[PDB]
Structure formats: structure tokens, C-alpha cells
Amino acid sequence: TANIPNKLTANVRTRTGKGASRQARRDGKVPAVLYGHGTDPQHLELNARDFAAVLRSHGTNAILTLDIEGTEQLALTKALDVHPIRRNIQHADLLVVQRGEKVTVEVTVLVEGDATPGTLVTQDANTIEIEAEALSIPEQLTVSVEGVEAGTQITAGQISLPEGVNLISDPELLVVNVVEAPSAEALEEEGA
């Protein structure tokens, strides 16, 4: 299941620094860096609005097609430095990638469906590491809860993992734990 890369435009940062980054961030642009086996850390401003839009559409983990001054590159979002408060993305890290390339990544895990009513489902690890190709990276994968029995644990090793993707996390990492819903005489008994 190939995911189509998203087409952004970028242009080489003329000069570097906190003043330059603050100014660029002020003009609705995100400073970022390309690296990888391209062996050239290349400093690129890109459109903040388009960056946020594509991150909304295809999560944190999505291939991009960068147009660097006409040259055409394939990139993959490695990290995003984001402000804790203003929540704007400050910086981005872009591994260079090509087809048929396995890469390690972290994919969010969103529990889906309703559970049995007497107990609450609670996730400890929201993200699971997987090894997968550049184009075949899943932006999210689901875990099944449909009327479980009494409280039991779920680990990464029993998830319906996609095709062409490989678990990296040790299979005994807990993801979602159904824990019995606290009674009336049990909910306010902890916390002091």
C-alpha cells in the first residue's frame, strides 16, 4: 500500500542563526534540515502553512517531495521541534530516502471501537516502533477492542500489523490495558 509523497517547495536558507530562524518563523516559514545518506546537511526554509497542512493530512510520518531550487528529492519527517505553549512547529528534520529502503519509525496506535461497559480501556504506549519502507509507512494502525472479557493486557506482538511492515519494539511492550472501572467506593480512595 504505497502512500503518495506530498509535494512541498523549499529554498536554501541564506544565513543561519537564531535571528534568522526567528525572522523566518515570523514570515510563516519553517526552518528545517535535510540529512540522511545524502551526506549533506542542507538548511531549508519551507512554507509553514503547507507544512502544517500536510502534517494534518498525513500525520508526523509522511514522505514529502521537496523541490530544492528545481532539484527533486524524496524526504521523510524525522523530528519536529515544537513549542510547548504556542504549539507552532519550530523546526523539522528530513532524512533523504529512496524507493525500496527499510527505515525505522514510530507509528501512533489509536484504540478503535467500544469496550465491554463495566471496565475502562487505557493505553500506556500510544506509539509502536515499526520497520517499513519509505512509501509503505502507515500513518496509524489500529488495535481491536470489542467487548473484551475481564481486565487483560495487550502487547505489540498480537496486533494486526500491516503487510510489508515489521515490529521493532520488543513484543512484550504493553499498549492498551483494560482495567476494571473503579466502583463508587473505589474511585476516590487513591490520590492522597
Binding site: 508526523t60 510547548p84 505553549i85 475502562l120 487505557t122 500510544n126 473503579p182 474511585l187 492522597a192
Partner: protein
């Protein structure tokens, strides 16, 4: 009340209350949380009141995580006394809160009730906070 079992030193200086919370700024345990916006000293009185507020509002089943601990003691010298004669005896306990730190976190099925319990807690705190969700 949340009180440390022992502190190595029982009379410290006032915690420096400047900067932005660098550690502990994300919601990880539950799905909704209360995330701070101002520097303050959250005493165990505030924490207990807020936790009881959340428990009263939801009242059925759901997990409340107080991921801040009041373990820093503020002392107070006895009343009617002049200046001098050394530092006082410690008599309340505090967590040092920066703008950015998720204070309380909640896990509960529905949305509106969870939001309302979180704002009920917020009203008991000496700061401005906001409700933050498990996703960016």
C-alpha cells in the same frame, strides 16, 4: 494531602519560578489533561481540592493522574514576631509550576463530562490553565 515521607533538607530557598516548563509538557497517562500557563506554587491544598473536584464531577469510573508532586517546603515564621532569630519552621508544601507543565491528567469515556471535570479542577488552582488533548 501529598506530603513527602522525608526530605534531605527541610528548609530550602524559594524555588526559582522563571522560564518555561522543559520537562513534563505532554499528556501521556490519560487522554485529556490540564496544562498550565503561569508560574506558581501549587500547594497540596490546591491539588487535593482539584482532585476531589474531578472525582465529584465524574463520580463513576475514570483515572485521575496527579503528575505533579508537592515536595518543596515553604516555611513561615510564627505570628506577631519581629525580623531575625533565624528562619522559620516549614509549614506548607508546594510544587513549582512553570507555564507548559501538564498538572492533572484524566482518562474517561466521553468528551463533555471530561472537559467539565477538568475545568472544575482548573477553578481551584491559582493559575490559568487549559485543557489539552492526547493528540497534536
Amino acid at each position: 494531602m501529598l506530603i513527602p515521607r522525608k526530605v534531605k533538607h527541610r528548609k530550602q530557598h524559594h524555588p526559582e519560578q522563571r522560564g518555561i516548563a522543559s520537562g513534563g509538557t505532554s499528556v501521556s497517562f490519560g487522554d485529556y489533561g490540564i496544562q498550565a500557563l503561569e508560574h506558581a506554587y501549587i500547594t497540596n491544598r490546591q491539588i487535593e481540592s482539584a482532585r476531589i473536584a474531578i472525582n465529584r464531577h465524574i463520580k463513576r469510573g475514570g483515572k485521575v493522574w496527579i503528575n505533579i508532586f508537592p515536595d518543596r517546603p515553604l516555611t513561615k515564621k510564627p505570628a506577631e514576631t519581629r525580623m531575625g532569630s533565624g528562619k522559620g519552621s516549614p509549614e506548607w508544601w508546594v510544587a513549582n509550576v512553570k507555564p507548559g507543565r501538564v498538572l492533572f491528567e484524566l482518562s474517561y469515556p466521553d468528551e463533555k463530562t471530561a472537559r467539565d471535570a477538568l475545568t472544575r479542577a482548573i477553578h481551584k488552582l491559582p493559575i490559568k490553565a487549559r485543557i489539552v488533548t492526547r493528540e497534536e
